[PDB]
Amino acid sequence: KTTMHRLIEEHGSVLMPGVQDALSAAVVEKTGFHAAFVSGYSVSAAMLGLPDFGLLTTTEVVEATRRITAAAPNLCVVVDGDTGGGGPLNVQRFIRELISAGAKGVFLEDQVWPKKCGHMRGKAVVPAEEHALKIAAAREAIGDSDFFLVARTDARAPHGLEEGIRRANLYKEAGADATFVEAPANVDELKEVSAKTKGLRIANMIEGGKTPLHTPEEFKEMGFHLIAHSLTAVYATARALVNIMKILKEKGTTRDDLDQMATFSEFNELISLESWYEMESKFKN
Amino acid sequence: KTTMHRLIEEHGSVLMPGVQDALSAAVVEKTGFHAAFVSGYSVSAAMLGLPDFGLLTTTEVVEATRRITAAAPNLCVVVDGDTGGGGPLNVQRFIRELISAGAKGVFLEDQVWPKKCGHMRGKAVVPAEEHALKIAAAREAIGDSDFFLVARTDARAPHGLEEGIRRANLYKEAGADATFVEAPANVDELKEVSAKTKGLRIANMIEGGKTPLHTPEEFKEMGFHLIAHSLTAVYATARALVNIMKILKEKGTTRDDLDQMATFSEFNELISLESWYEMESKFKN
Amino acid sequence: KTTMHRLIEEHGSVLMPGVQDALSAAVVEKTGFHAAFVSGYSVSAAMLGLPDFGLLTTTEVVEATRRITAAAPNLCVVVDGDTGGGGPLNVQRFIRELISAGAKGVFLEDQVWPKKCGHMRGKAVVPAEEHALKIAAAREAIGDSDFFLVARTDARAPHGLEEGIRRANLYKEAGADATFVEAPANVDELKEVSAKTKGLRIANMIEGGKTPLHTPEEFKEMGFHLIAHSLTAVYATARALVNIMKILKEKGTTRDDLDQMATFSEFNELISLESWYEMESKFK
Amino acid sequence: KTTMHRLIEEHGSVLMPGVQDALSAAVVEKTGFHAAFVSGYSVSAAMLGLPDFGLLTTTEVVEATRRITAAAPNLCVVVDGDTGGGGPLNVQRFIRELISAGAKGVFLEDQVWPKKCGHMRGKAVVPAEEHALKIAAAREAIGDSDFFLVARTDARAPHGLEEGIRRANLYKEAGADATFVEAPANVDELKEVSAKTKGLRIANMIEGGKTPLHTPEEFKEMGFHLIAHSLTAVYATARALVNIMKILKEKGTTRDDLDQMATFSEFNELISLESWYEMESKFK
Numbered sequence A, B: 001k002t003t004m005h006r007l008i009e010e011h012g013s014v015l016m017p018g019v020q021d022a023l024s025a026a027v028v029e030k031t032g033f034h035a036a037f038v039s040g041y042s043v044s045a046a047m048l049g050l051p052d053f054g055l056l057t058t059t060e061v062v063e064a065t066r067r068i069t070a071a072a073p074n075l076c077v078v079v080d081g082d083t084g085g086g087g088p089l090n091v092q093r094f095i096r097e098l099i100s101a102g103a104k105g106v107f108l109e110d111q112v113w114p115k116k117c118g119h120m121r122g123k124a125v126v127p128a129e130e131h132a133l134k135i136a137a138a139r140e141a142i143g144d145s146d147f148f149l150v151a152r153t154d155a156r157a158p159h160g161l162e163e164g165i166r167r168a169n170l171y172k173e174a175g176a177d178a179t180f181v182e183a184p185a186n187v188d189e190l191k192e193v194s195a196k197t198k199g200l201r202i203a204n205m206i207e208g209g210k211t212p213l214h215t216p217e218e219f220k221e222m223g224f225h226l227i228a229h230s231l232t233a234v235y236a237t238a239r240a241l242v243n244i245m246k247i248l249k250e251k252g253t254t255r256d257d258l259d260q261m262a263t264f265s266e267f268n269e270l271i272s273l274e275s276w277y278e279m280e281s282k283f284k285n
Numbered sequence C, D: 001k002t003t004m005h006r007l008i009e010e011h012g013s014v015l016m017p018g019v020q021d022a023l024s025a026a027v028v029e030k031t032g033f034h035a036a037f038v039s040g041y042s043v044s045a046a047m048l049g050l051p052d053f054g055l056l057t058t059t060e061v062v063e064a065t066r067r068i069t070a071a072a073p074n075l076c077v078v079v080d081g082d083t084g085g086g087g088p089l090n091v092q093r094f095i096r097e098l099i100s101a102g103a104k105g106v107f108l109e110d111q112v113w114p115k116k117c118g119h120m121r122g123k124a125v126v127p128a129e130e131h132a133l134k135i136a137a138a139r140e141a142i143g144d145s146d147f148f149l150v151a152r153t154d155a156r157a158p159h160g161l162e163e164g165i166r167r168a169n170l171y172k173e174a175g176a177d178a179t180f181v182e183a184p185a186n187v188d189e190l191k192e193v194s195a196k197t198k199g200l201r202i203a204n205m206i207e208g209g210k211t212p213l214h215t216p217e218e219f220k221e222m223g224f225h226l227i228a229h230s231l232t233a234v235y236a237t238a239r240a241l242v243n244i245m246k247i248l249k250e251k252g253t254t255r256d257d258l259d260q261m262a263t264f265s266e267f268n269e270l271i272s273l274e275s276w277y278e279m280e281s282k283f284k
């Protein structure tokens, strides 16, 4: 059916770096990866300068998705759908719009709106049944479309692995392609997720988050098929930005320390300047 | 009149890091800077994954400007206006829109549309008079609005410092607040720009570009008042992204090398997570 | 001392036609009105072709706002905010955004999300305190901004006029500038709202609606200050398009029905083709 | 074998009403037409309240397109591309964007930037080869895409019908699917374009325009295949808004002129309030 399906087949567990925009999406594709995750958290920070505090609207992740699609046309793009922007009807519209934005899948959550990062302090969740219907709602919207449907549960934090899990299996029944139990606290937890969730499983790596950091081979072992590395891109970026700007402020110059930036061979290699010069010429007289 | 004016007074030459979005704009403000430059080149790469090859529309830099404004409300934001999006009438509309997008100034160019980076291989320029009118056009649109009007000339590349310069003085007559002679090849050139251009002068530092890299004290000396450091932010970003993603691809994990990313103390310190938690609480019962 | 407060004083009942894009805002401003309301209902239809089902997002409403505002830069423009996009924080990003988008007011509503129209079949409502807090939040985010705040309650249908009224009064105390009890069913019910809600009051005229149709001069008498005429524009528009496109479809041309469309001088009068040609020549 | 090529074959002259947003696209589709044209003129007015002065950007036209497309997902939608946003590269980003936005064709024009309308006072034109190349570029960017390409020439006013014609033929050879000589002044001039331009031909009906008003069945006879009826919608609309808002302003209410606005079942018929209520109940 799906590119995720044909992707989780061809490989063991698929590593899907988190992306916050076109340049990052570009770098991800260029580095060989076959999938990428439009991260709400990242998009919030990068696009709006906002904490993952449920301020980012469904409309905005769509705009960002459209750009990221265009910029990395090959990358199999999966989008952070948060709450899914309302009730069933909102979800469906949102789904339809992401299919038009060129994406190939969603994550949708358990949380009360407005939501927070799954590794953040004070989350709450709607009754399972209520979200089940939304999965069901997205399911119908997707139809034949090439669209992977990940149902996420933030239930562990306030209710423990038990709750989180049963919700996972319920969303699977509802018609999800795969399941995502957010923020397992350790290995044991992870492995326990793997034993009592029916079908394909996600797992989200967050540097300094609440889960142990593992590899596609290690996850294949534990039985997780899609690995979102959500904040790698943004987190790297933020350091680099703070570093270079400090250097800039106190010297007033990059002049001395240029090993922090990139080359033009490289930057333009990155974006294919030469490649364009070529197209441009095909069309003068 | 302007915040640039009152800024170029309070300081000698103002260092204005180039910005490509909210997160970067945020980091710039947070690091003490008093000004920032919405770079078309950066916005192209970051927002669209596109080379500075004149594909970015006036409408898009406006959207980006609006976000960057909101995200760094204090930063005195100056926008890369490229060609200015058409003829006089387009410029005016564009100007009006940037004033609404919360910005405080523009750079507008000499180039034939579609334009290219000022440090790029094959640029062309419209007759001086033609651009003079556009400066004049923006001038009237600005009125009392708090808006700094930098007129840029890309004439050096294809016609030499002479042409570039006379164009500079002409755009000054036309009503520009300050003047920008793009891509002086060396010090001598710079200093020559400073001797025969009447009034306030810009200077653009591009890492590995065609100009020598200098500091606000050094520029104050040479007589340049506004220093755009256009590609620092984006260039740092691109390295960091390529680095981390390579590491990610070949290990499948950041686990070992976490000194490349940022902390949560730090990331959230960056965006003020705690600060939000505080506002959020003011309003529960 | 907000612009609207000013308008409600210079006049007695401000009449505020609904508007759903740039052209309609223009026509509205060109017609002599001083205030205009961005209708979420209208906008779903005009801008997205969607029933008023709480699909139109807060992002969408703002874009919509921006254009309306630029095109009709004098109209005191007031935005239907529906639910406010979620919690008090979402409300606050939204007020900020709207202020940035050139508006001077919002209406914020009682309803569960996703909201429905105000004269539509199924409506539920969040606990009054919850909205009182959103209002409050709104208020703080408004600060000095010239931005008239309207608290709407949709409680009348599910709960009777009493609730509608206490909630209005509750929301006034939480710092709205004016209060809107949706869908009084008739004159008595208006007068009752007028008698029992303290402060500035909104009425909302919708043709075919549950509330009876009345004029400013009359409303002035019934103690109402801000009359939304929300769906008129979209409604006139919709009929116009349906008629013409029938003709165009059946007769294959407009040839015989030209008096349906507007005039060159007329149209240009609405969008100023002479104001432009001039500015254009000034800079040739 | 593009959708439009299909439409021009199933029928003889395709009649393609102009449309400037979601509601109008809807009405147009709901009325039985199979094709619709996104009018840049219309859109400047409706969406931004701007004279057709080449202010509407390529970005703007696309957003506009997307909405129109979703709301009217069967209408074979064809976009007024004006100048194409600049050089051949800009043309190409634009074709891509439009294909992504769900369209099935564009019209690309001869004019210097910034363009004006096609029946407006001052018009100049770029060297034919320059546009031929843009067309070509367009063509390549189109590839397999179901996307009917129209090359428009505005040379008739500044240069006479001869230039208009050679340029059309020039642009056909550069790989447009159809050709549009703007503003033949009358029947003779149409027939002359019909006789001297090779391939598929566009005519563009504008009420008050320079070209005389004719029907598909007639145009079929004069050898034209795609008739834009570009400004009708906006024009009907504009009159509708001006009348109503006069009434609303003078009488203070719509109370006495209700037959100007549309019906609840009617309106909802255009935007499907029953289709929704149903999907809604399916998931409660």
Ligand SMILES: [Mg+2]
Binding pocket: A039, A040, A041, A052, A080, A082, A116, A117
């Ligand atoms: Mg998220």
Ligand SMILES: [Mg+2]
Binding pocket: B039, B040, B041, B052, B080, B082, B116, B117
């Ligand atoms: Mg630039």
Ligand SMILES: [Mg+2]
Binding pocket: C039, C040, C041, C052, C080, C082, C116, C117, C118
């Ligand atoms: Mg509403």
Ligand SMILES: [Mg+2]
Binding pocket: D039, D040, D041, D052, D080, D082, D116, D117, D118
């Ligand atoms: Mg046009």
